Ligand binder design. Structure first.
Ligand SMILES: Cc1cc2nc3c(=O)[nH]c(=O)nc-3n(C[C@H](O)[C@H](O)[C@H](O)COP(=O)(O)O)c2cc1C
Ligand SMILES: Cc1cc2nc3c(=O)[nH]c(=O)nc-3n(C[C@H](O)[C@H](O)[C@H](O)COP(=O)(O)O)c2cc1C
Ligand SMILES: Nc1ncnc2c1ncn2[C@@H]1O[C@H](COP(=O)(O)OP(=O)(O)OP(=O)(O)O)[C@@H](O)[C@H]1O
Ligand SMILES: Nc1ncnc2c1ncn2[C@@H]1O[C@H](COP(=O)(O)OP(=O)(O)OP(=O)(O)O)[C@@H](O)[C@H]1O
Ligand SMILES: [Mg+2]
Ligand SMILES: [Mg+2]
Ligand SMILES: [Mg+2]
Ligand SMILES: [Mg+2]
Lengths: 330, 330
């Protein structure tokens, strides 16, 4: 048995009648799927618990994400191997807390709103990776550090200083946020984890045996930015949004890093400086993407590799072979 | 009138009897101070609402922080200028939800635990500055970017690469976390805001007219690390924990930066690269602290300034006068 808890936001103002309609249909369909649960709403926020056979639940849940009347769905907990039903009497018990006024529910419905309002804000400042760990019943703070091989991704906007010196504050942030949004969307799509933003820089990493997906994310980013530049409106600052990209491979420490007040779940190691160094080299070369031979050697597909003879790196241990992809972009 | 909501963790296992004892005494003292509220507990978590005259509330609250039976106090909301009492009938109404079993409270007490467990984890990955903004009724995501003068603080561990190459993974993280903890404690104490950890680096900033407090935090850090090195156990890696420090002043953008999935409330601008550049210069000089003349010119106290003739900076616009403090440390 699987039990699923989640929360969402009202996509549009719903009346107490529309909510009841959802509960009724939900009750009918859950009655036949041998599913039980409870649906609660409070000042434009939905809360639902859903329990039953994992297969049947997976079906119902993915259909709930299709529902237009709510958005910002976030699953707080996914229990597997459950043996007991929390609410074996209710196929769907709807509880509109906005109308309930029992004196004992009053202190609890206030705290619930306060805790939820705060939670939904912390989400935006939190990495989506932590939420997945929490949902699985693992406390990410209790994770012990470990050494692991990763592909480190570094990309940095070209000559961002001029933007700040010639554009209003609102437009600079708009340019950098658009860039971060494009990078994050493609990296996450290829399995990458965006760990840190460093000024106008994106820091990310891939599994150590995923060099093909790091190269493909890099290439797709460069393609997306070229379409972005050519399709931007007239006089838009996005027309001159260029980036470099550097990829390196190496053994890094992954784990909780920081102080008692704040910490990050990120990586640490030499491969970070190499990736950063390589990204910087793109300013000198015509190629916007450069990577080490350990990345090139870890790829499984037959990329159009080009061997670059500009390995003037500093701070490393020995010589490093530099590579790029020879295509219309680079 | 002021209404105060907060949550805390049981410092030790409390029985339902000890809790009732807290409520009773709380009721007696709140009855005379014209104070009303509600105290709720759930699986080792306290929740309390407190409302009344701001002065009387401030007194009660600071005494509650003195109570040893709970810890990790975090105020979720501080309403000021309140006109209505939420619970005008209860000086202190205690509700032990662990024992309550009303069928209607059951779905709500589960969600409450799930939301709280998650919240308390997100706190550790969240900057304490966001929580203060949320408590005041301001949504930090709706804050618009602005240009502002700041003193940027940069400090970086000296030769951290050797630590990773010669110590087990657990001890490296222990060394960097101890360093981050020392830096954060002193910076926060002097009014500074620690915004980002960049590998073995601490990035922080001060108000633009607080150069004296940035210099004093820097000096105190260097003193703390010297005591840490001399007092460490035998063969401890903390004996060789050294840091550099760079301070710069300039106009930076402050605001929400990132993508739709994750964003940071941080700064951006040239002063960041200058502070980072200055910190790096300490590797060449005997002084562990260096700062620009704009920092030196913004100080109000009569520091023992020393004018450094090593302004070989790169990437800047023009020459930059370098300064340090001449004392037993540097
Ligand atoms: C917050 C929210 C919760 C919902 N929960 C359920 C549920 O638990 N079970 C269910 O069968 N449908 C649920 N639905 C509705 C489904 O998304 C979908 O509309 C329904 O299954 C399709 O109904 P139909 O059989 O008439 O096509 C929910 C919708 C919303 C907005
Ligand atoms: C979660 C928790 C909540 C408390 N809430 C209150 C309160 O609302 N009002 C109050 O007067 N004391 C409250 N106290 C107790 C005070 O911290 C303190 O012990 C008490 O005011 C001192 O009692 P005394 O007058 O016998 O010295 C609380 C203690 C704990 C652990
Ligand atoms: N060492 C650093 N550590 C952290 N953040 C930095 C550092 N240097 C710069 N930044 C941040 O990055 C922003 C852009 O600096 P950057 O070095 O990328 O310049 P640029 O004008 O974009 O040129 P380039 O083409 O060399 O990248 C700076 O305003 C600052 O916010
Ligand atoms: N450009 C960079 N951007 C972000 N993080 C970096 C960068 N370079 C290094 N790091 C991180 O910082 C860690 C330490 O690198 P760093 O350059 O500080 O070397 P170090 O051995 O501590 O020497 P130093 O005395 O020069 O500081 C690296 O392992 C990596 O985790
Ligand atoms: Mg740049
Ligand atoms: Mg940069
Ligand atoms: Mg270092
Ligand atoms: Mg460093």
């Amino acid at each position: 048995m699987k039990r699923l808890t989640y929360i969402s936001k009202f996509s549009r103002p719903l009346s107490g009648d529309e909510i009841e309609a959802i509960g009724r249909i939900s009750s009918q369909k859950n009655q036949q799927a041998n599913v039980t649960g409870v649906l609660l709403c409070l000042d434009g926020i939905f809360f639902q618990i859903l329990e039953g056979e994992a297969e049947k639940i997976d079906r119902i849940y993915e259909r709930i994400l299709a529902d237009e009347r709510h958005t910002d769905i976030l699953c707080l907990k996914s229990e597997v191997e459950v043996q007991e039903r929390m609410f074996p009497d209710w196929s769907m018990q709807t509880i509109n807390l906005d109308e309930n006024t029992d004196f004992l529910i009053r202190p609890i419905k206030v705290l619930l709103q306060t805790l939820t309002e705060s939670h939904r804000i912390l989400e935006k400042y939190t990495q989506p990776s932590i939420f997945k760990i929490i949902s699985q019943g693992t406390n990410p703070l209790n994770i012990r550090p470990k050494a692991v091989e990763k592909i480190v991704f570094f990309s940095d906007i070209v000559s961002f200083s001029t933007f700040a010196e010639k554009l209003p504050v609102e437009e600079v942030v708009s340019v950098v946020n658009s860039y971060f949004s494009v990078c994050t969307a493609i990296i996450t799509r290829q399995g990458g984890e965006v760990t840190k933003f460093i000024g106008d820089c994106v820091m990310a990493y891939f599994d150590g045996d995923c060099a093909d997906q790091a190269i493909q994310a890099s290439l797709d980013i460069l393609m997306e930015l070229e379409i972005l530049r050519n399709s931007a409106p007239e006089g838009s600052p996005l027309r001159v949004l260029y980036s470099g990209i550097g990829l390196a491979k190496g053994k890094v420490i992954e784990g909780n890093i920081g102080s008692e007040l704040k910490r990050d779940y990120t990586i640490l190691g030499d491969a970070v400086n190499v990736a950063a160094r390589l990204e910087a080299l793109t300013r000198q070369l015509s190629q916007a993407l450069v990577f080490s031979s350990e990345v090139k050697n870890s790829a499984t597909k037959s990329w159009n590799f080009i061997w670059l003879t500009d390995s003037e790196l500093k701070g490393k241990s020995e010589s490093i072979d530099i590579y790029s992809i020879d295509n219309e972009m680079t």
